[model samples]
Target: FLISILEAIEPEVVYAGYDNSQPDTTNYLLSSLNRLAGKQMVSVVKWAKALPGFRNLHLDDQMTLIQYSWMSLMAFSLGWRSYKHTNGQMLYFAPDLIFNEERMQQSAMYDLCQGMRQISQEFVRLQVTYEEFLCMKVLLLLSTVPKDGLKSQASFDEMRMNYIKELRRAIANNSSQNWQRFYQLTKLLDSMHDLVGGLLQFCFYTFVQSQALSVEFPEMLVEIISDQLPKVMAGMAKPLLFHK
Candidate 1:
């Protein structure tokens, strides 16, 4: 037999207890508890207290978050880079986490090619003119360092500079609506790619070496250009709109 017992436990409104205790501490406690619980049964919390559920944070906060959060994230990254994986062991081969490399070599190549078509959708959403997308893509794919069939990373520097400039234009244009979240999303994916790419690289190098000329598939890059990213810039061969 099943029975439902709703025991009502309405705690004192921490925010309303401001005169009883230190205002700041009471505010912090109330906010933390409500956020952790979604809300108290009374549901007296103000919606503004739960920020980021809306699209209208101040622009200064937007830019500040965009710059400062990305900067602050680097500290932990630099710290972890110390124990970073090297390509000399068995733990490196977690085929489970590798994005999608079980296919044949040429299959991977064509997969990368098809990638350019899909990531273009994000640019289209930004209203980056079709001609701009085409031109920017030429710079990206053409600028890539040669490998498989692309051959040589010669023009990457120039392409990187120009592409970032143009892409920033699009980013700035869209900043009013949801650019902050988009930037955060891109930064998040970039970090995820950074972490996962390292693992994939170690495995890629470990697996592709033997008795003679060893060719590294540049798996670190493939994860970025083909997996973690969705072609945000020129020659960027992956999709940028991701969930991680």
Candidate 2:
């Protein structure tokens, strides 16, 4: 039932509408990607609302989780798309705005792009199943929280535990090496936090220099970034790491 709900609510493809014909500029590329992210942000919220057991949390918790983990969610999905669609050769941000090496460098986020692509390569290496991906995505949403804790901490922990078990179930069906696979996957999930931390830092920097950088942010991205940046930077938004 949980798997079915996740599958049913999976977001559709979003296009970046990048114009390849036009001369590529750093600002233009960044702006288009930000716009695409803003659009995907809407779908992320809708997906969370439709996700089983998500809406059971306090309303503020729902919003907090979304705001805290949106970048990780976006990055993780981008990895999956790159793996499935492009064999990890390029970033499949959208059907239309796939990033090749040139664009990766042109966008001034080459290192970040490489980090994201490395994740896709890992997905390819593991041959991650769709069921496993869905479970892990939910885990990402539940992975970050305020240092003080959520209003319904008990409920939040229960939901996270359920998805961890769900991920185990998904893995069991795929591999005979059950515990080993589970360990690898959880480690990978932890690694996502490290990568997304870099992304959030870059995002915050870009946001502060939006006018100078000529990068435009939609209101949705603006609100979340402005709210999340300081707390994350200050280590107030604690990522629940599975490793030491």
Candidate 3:
């Protein structure tokens, strides 16, 4: 189970290191990011279904979990695999999607980059382990309150409690610092949620509010960012520092 999730979510760049070859630059730029974003969504859902009791849940519960947790998992996955430059000016989620801090000023995604940096840098500082991240993925999916579409909220409630217990135990078993380690892990997961919210706000502003809203995102990504996100982001204002 561990190896399967880790391998499925591993960055493609890890497999082709030291090769002096250009990426398949057909679409390039945001399109590639869009492409990988879709893959990340699919990969995560695939990993979730492989979980012991995930499929036994209602289909609506499964779908709701996937939709809500998409950006959080994406942020966590990118942060987990990112390489931050010593110069602090550039970070790469993949080989092709490099964001320069200086150049970010001119990009449409400047706010997005900053939000991602917050999560990615914290992930770097904490040296989060695969076991830790895997546990968080489960936790995030199970953490949400089911508003509707649950066949049995009682059953999901019990399932959610079990996942939390198991995640706590998993974290304690894997870390030398014991329960403190689990606390830190949970805190990190919370930070990822904050970043996910921030990034979604930024994207919503860009895709829906901006005058130049011609930015084309992949369909799957657009569904999450534009369609589903409004439900989660309702009443949420952009951070005061979002543009600063």
Q: What is the TM-score of each candidate against the true structure?
A: 0.22, 0.97, 0.72
Cα lDDT of all candidates, in order? Answer: 0.28, 0.91, 0.60
RMSD of 3: 6.4
Off by over 4 Å in 2: 173-176
Write the residue-wise lDDT of candidate 3 on 40-129 in tens digits.
666677677877677788887787777777777667666655633432235565554555664355454677777777666776677666
Q: Give stretches of model 1 more than 4 Å off.
A: 1-158, 170-174, 178-182, 192-196, 208-244
The residue pairs in collision within model 2 are none
| lDDT for each residue of candidate 1 in 1-244, tens digit (9 for 90 to 100) | 0000001211222222212243233223223222322222122122211222112434432222222122112222222221122221111111221112322132223342123222323333443433333223222222212122222123334434554455445344355545564464244334433443343343234333412323222332233223322222233233222344
- Name the 10 consecutive residues with the lowest summed lDDT in model 2: 168-177
Q: Which scores higher on lDDT, 1 or 3?
A: 3
Clash count of each predicted structure: 12, 0, 0
Model 3 earns a TM-score of 0.72
Candidate 2 residues 41-152, lDDT tens each? 9999999999888888999999889999999999999999999999999999999898998999899989999999999999999899999999999999999999999998
Worst 10 residues of 1 by lDDT: 1-10
